[PDB]
């Protein structure tokens, strides 16, 4: 009985050189749950990130708005359009998009999330064309 089509064999050859008494409490250790964070919004005069939307952020805004226009139907465009993509794009260009860009720069160990909330209607818009 020639079987053939063997499952081979697999070999790993390397080493991972990853460079007060105590007992078992259940509350001092463990706690897989992470502490709830508090949102610190950096004041509008202390924001040091770009006031021009990146192509990534502008694309994300347009995509989110287009999806929400696919589920909803409300908009502020005087010129009506037949596609949610067009409506969202013109909403971004006309500076009437109902979305905010939150840029997170910190995770403080005290459970503090420091963010900069940027208004796309006041921001510069990249090429996108």
């Amino acid at each position: 009985l020639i079987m053939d089509d063997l499952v081979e064999e697999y070999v790993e050859t390397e080493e991972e050189n990853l460079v007060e008494i105590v007992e078992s409490p259940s509350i001092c250790e463990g706690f897989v749950q992470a502490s709830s964070q508090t949102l610190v919004i950096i004041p509008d005069n202390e924001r040091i990130t770009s006031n021009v939307l990146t192509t990534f952020e502008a694309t994300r805004l347009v995509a989110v708005r287009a999806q929400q226009l696919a589920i909803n139907g409300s908009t502020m465009l005087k010129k009506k359009y037949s596609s949610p993509i067009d409506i969202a794009k013109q909403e971004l260009f006309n500076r009437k998009i109902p979305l905010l860009v939150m840029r997170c720069i910190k995770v403080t160990p005290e459970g503090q999330k420091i963010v900069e909330i940027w208004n796309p209607r006041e921001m510069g818009i990249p090429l996108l064309d």
Binding site: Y10, L69, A70, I71, G73, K80, Y81, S82, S83, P84, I87
Partner: protein, 76 residues
């Protein structure tokens, strides 16, 4: 290994709604345009939701169905 769970199923995937074919030259297409055979265009579909702003536009697609192109065969 390459055929393992991580490299084959996690770091990559088999996907739906994808087509493969031989490429060929068409000097009458723009650099940002691709020639898609109608057999593949009727196979792959684009999901357009029905709203007030597009219901007029999507009606010719809905009325054609499988019978004529452009058409559609699926409604959620």
């Amino acid at each position: 290994r390459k055929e393992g769970r991580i490299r084959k199923s996690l770091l990559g995937s088999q996907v739906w709604s994808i087509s493969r074919s031989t490429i060929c030259g068409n000097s009458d297409l723009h650099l940002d345009e691709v020639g898609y055979p109608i057999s593949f265009a009727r196979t792959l579909q684009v999901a357009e939701t029905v709203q007030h702003y597009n219901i007029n536009r999507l009606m010719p697609y809905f009325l054609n169905g499988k019978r004529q192109y452009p058409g559609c065969s699926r409604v959620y």
